[PDB]
Amino acid sequence: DWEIPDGQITVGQRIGSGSFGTVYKGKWHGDVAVKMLNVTAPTPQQLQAFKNEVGVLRKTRHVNILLFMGYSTKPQLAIVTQWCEGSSLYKHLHASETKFEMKKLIDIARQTARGMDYLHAKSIIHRDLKSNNIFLHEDNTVKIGDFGLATVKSRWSGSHQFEQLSGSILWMAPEVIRMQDSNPYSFQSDVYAFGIVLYELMTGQLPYSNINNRDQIIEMVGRGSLSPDLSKVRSNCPKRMKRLMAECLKKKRDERPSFPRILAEIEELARE
Amino acid sequence: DWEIPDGQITVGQRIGSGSFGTVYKGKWHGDVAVKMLNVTAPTPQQLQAFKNEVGVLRKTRHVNILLFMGYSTKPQLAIVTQWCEGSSLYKHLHASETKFEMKKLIDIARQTARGMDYLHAKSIIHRDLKSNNIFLHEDNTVKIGDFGLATVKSRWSGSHQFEQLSGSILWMAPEVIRMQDSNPYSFQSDVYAFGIVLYELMTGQLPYSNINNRDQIIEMVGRGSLSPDLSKVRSNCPKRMKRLMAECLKKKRDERPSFPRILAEIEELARE
Ligand SMILES: Cc1ccc2c(Nc3cccc(Cl)c3F)nccc2c1NC(=O)c1csc2c(N)ncnc12
Ligand SMILES: Cc1ccc2c(Nc3cccc(Cl)c3F)nccc2c1NC(=O)c1csc2c(N)ncnc12
Ligand SMILES: [Cl-]
Ligand SMILES: [Cl-]
Ligand SMILES: [Cl-]
Ligand SMILES: [Cl-]
Ligand SMILES: [Cl-]
Ligand SMILES: [Cl-]
Ligand SMILES: [Cl-]
Ligand SMILES: [Cl-]
Ligand SMILES: [Cl-]
Ligand SMILES: [Cl-]
Ligand SMILES: [Cl-]
The missing domain is CATH 3.30.200.20 (Phosphorylase Kinase; domain 1)
Incomplete structure (x- = not known):
């Protein structure tokens, strides 16, 4: 109770x-x-x-x-x-532009994957993973939550939610942006959103910065003719991490790895 | 489940x-x-x-x-x-002799009182609070537990436990050291143990250091003729904190405050 x-x-x-x-x-x-x-x-x-x-x-x-x-x-x-003191990962990467060493970027990816691996092992689909939903408690410990749910965004009604696209569009898998279904959300769309978070960590910036209108992103990501440009990744980014990102961002959801293997790969990369 | x-x-x-x-x-x-x-x-x-x-x-x-x-x-x-990285408060005070500023000592007391206030609000009597059972996660966040239970010490059988006195004697209220009952343990004996933790924080050392045998402590604390010497407290110790310690250490359990009031007093003292 x-x-x-x-x-x-x-x-x-x-x-x-x-x-x-x-x-x-x-x-x-x-x-x-x-x-x-x-x-x-x-x-x-x-x-x-x-x-x-x-x-x-x-x-x-x-x-x-x-x-x-x-x-x-x-x-x-x-x-x-x-109550957590600190700020979201989004704030750190794209507002304060905190200068995280590569080791800390990998640590943040590893803690995020721990939490997501746990959620999926509990049969919980997150549905809105993104850097604004990854809180850095004392700027050190990852706390995954949904910080927009039941304030700015409504709670879920099936796969509908009011202000669904608000601040979330860049993290939505192709099959979620199209919604050729009544539920496009899966463990695999969580994995795609995690790939976009990896992109933010390894480039320091948001995908599709050059595109000038939301509906363009909608159309071209749903069509499969738009994808994060992995060549804009920082030079100290490990080769393993680029491989992993490319795996998480695959267009057909069944081709993306699951979080147990994602986590083991990041743990290996952290060991160095 | x-x-x-x-x-x-x-x-x-x-x-x-x-x-x-x-x-x-x-x-x-x-x-x-x-x-x-x-x-x-x-x-x-x-x-x-x-x-x-x-x-x-x-x-x-x-x-x-x-x-x-x-x-x-x-x-x-x-x-x-x-899994917590770090070490117990006991290790910090009496082994590494970490030099905590007064502000951090008060912060540790405040987090301990938060956890104990919560436990007592949940009708949980701890029974073995002491600085070795207060873990400093990353040497910053208090995690209360019972780190001896079901390894060195047995689990509780009524108010009995094998190796009950082991490393715990200094934190035991008078009525617990006597055990003129089948249960001396109460919210108020938890409060006494917390007073002894406050003593460790404000003096940096263990009570009764001069006494040469355990049975002496047993007898004289059970008799009421032995009590922590609050004059050995550091000079920068706030007056409020000495008052609070003396309240928690009272011999008759019904005279000790409860953790809601303990916590509010420490919160006030932290505000300064
Ligand atoms: C009160 C409350 C309840 C449910 C939450 C929630 N529910 C949830 C839903 C789906 C999946 C998952 Cl994993 C979830 F955790 N998510 C995130 C935050 C949640 C939350 N807190 C805040 O909104 C919040 C804003 S600022 C801040 C801060 N500084 N410290 C701590 N909280 C906050
Ligand atoms: C596994 C396990 C189970 C129950 C615990 C327990 N049970 C308990 C009983 C009564 C009251 C309360 Cl409050 C309790 F929490 N207490 C404390 C520790 C407990 C514990 N872990 C350790 O023994 C431990 C030693 S080292 C270390 C570390 N570095 N990190 C994290 N764990 C540890
Ligand atoms: Cl680090
Ligand atoms: Cl709602
Ligand atoms: Cl919901
Ligand atoms: Cl609806
Ligand atoms: Cl792991
Ligand atoms: Cl629970
Ligand atoms: Cl502090
Ligand atoms: Cl046992
Ligand atoms: Cl028990
Ligand atoms: Cl027994
Ligand atoms: Cl409080």
């Missing part, structure tokens, strides 16, 4: 907000983050999606997954997690 | 061992610690004590409690946790 009784959490500064909820810093036996719906009486849909998220988080005990701590239903449906 | 199927954990280097089990470094979606019984067919007593420990750990989701990750029953009863 992880329900936190009403009145125990002290809700603090507002941290993030969108059409589907708000996240605050709070206090409950130390620092916590608290994500709640902006509404008063949830629709059955809103309640059930809340339960889906809690049921995913309740399955996770791993140092590279953000730690779920509890939930509450009075007065608002809220999810409580550990 | 947290049972890890057989064959998934790769058991590595032996880390610790005693009459009641062994702990190894291992691999399972990253680094783990794995504690198993040294035996083949456990007695009902051994099995049940294993279940007691798993049932305590399964109740904990807190950044200052060592993260339980799973257990297994084939081929040996094993408990799996995160």
Whole structure:
């Protein structure tokens, strides 16, 4: 039982907000983050999606997954997690332009693969892996989460989500950008998104920087005539890492490796 | 369900061992610690004590409690946790004699109180809090655990445990050293042990260093004529902290504060 009784959490500064909820810093036996719906009486849909998220988080005990701590239903449906100081990998690579040594870049890839390997072993498909969803706790430890879910983006309704493409387009596998289905999401589309994260780590920049419109990326990635340019990778990038990236980014999902083998390859590369 | 199927954990280097089990470094979606019984067919007593420990750990989701990750029953009863690099607080204070600034000493006390406040809110009595059981993950983050349980020391049988006094005597409340009962252990004896940890932080040394025999400490602490000498505390120790220590170390257990108030006092002192 992880329900936190009403009145125990002290809700603090507002941290993030969108059409589907708000996240605050709070206090409950130390620092916590608290994500709640902006509404008063949830629709059955809103309640059930809340339960889906809690049921995913309740399955996770791993140092590279953000730690779920509890939930509450009075007065608002809220999810409580550990509070992490630091910032997303996206901020580090593309805003502060932190200068990570190659060793630390590989360490970040390795911790990300540990968390993703764990999630897939728990039959959890992430659906929105990207560098903004990889938090560097004290700029050292990877915490995978979905930092847009139920604030800026809605919770999942099948394979639909409001603001689905928002800040996510560059990480979407070809079969996800097309959605010739009712579920394109799989372990293999998580693997593709991880390949794009590897691209960010090894180039320091976002793919398709030269393309001038989103719909262009939509069309050409869904068509198979657009792919990350692996020649823009830094010179100190290990040969193994370029091979691995190319494997994760393959157009047909069944050709991509799985995270057990991804992780073992990165572990080998880290050993050097 | 947290049972890890057989064959998934790769058991590595032996880390610790005693009459009641062994702990190894291992691999399972990253680094783990794995504690198993040294035996083949456990007695009902051994099995049940294993279940007691798993049932305590399964109740904990807190950044200052060592993260339980799973257990297994084939081929040996094993408990799996995160792997922490670093060393115990005891090692830092009394072996490497690390020079912690007062701010970091207070931070360690504050994280310890967060974890203990959480445990007591979950109705978990620790029973063996001491600086060797406070792990400094990357020498920065407190992880409370019981690092002697089911290796050097046995699991709990009521209020009995083999090697109960081993390395623990200095942290035992008067009513625990006497055991005029079948259970002297309470939230309040945890609070006393925390006071002794505060003493180690503020003096840098172990209480009763001058006394030459264990049985002397037994007798005089059980009698009430022996107490930590708070005048040996460092000069930069805040007045609030000496007051708090004296409160936690009171002889009659009902006079000691509880961890919600302990934590709020340390949080205030940290703010300065
Ligand atoms: C409260 C809360 C609940 C669920 C989360 C969540 N749920 C989730 C959903 C699907 C898959 C996975 Cl793996 C998930 F973890 N993901 C990420 C963050 C989640 C979260 N916290 C924040 O939103 C947050 C913003 S800033 C910040 C900070 N500085 N420290 C700690 N938290 C935060
Ligand atoms: C495997 C395992 C299982 C249960 C533990 C346990 N159980 C427990 C019992 C009662 C109360 C509480 Cl709070 C508890 F956490 N406590 C502490 C450690 C526990 C543990 N790990 C070690 O023994 C360990 C030695 S070295 C090291 C390291 N470097 N990194 C991580 N682990 C270790
Ligand atoms: Cl607090
Ligand atoms: Cl759980
Ligand atoms: Cl590093
Ligand atoms: Cl929603
Ligand atoms: Cl969801
Ligand atoms: Cl919909
Ligand atoms: Cl690994
Ligand atoms: Cl500090
Ligand atoms: Cl035992
Ligand atoms: Cl036990
Ligand atoms: Cl016995």
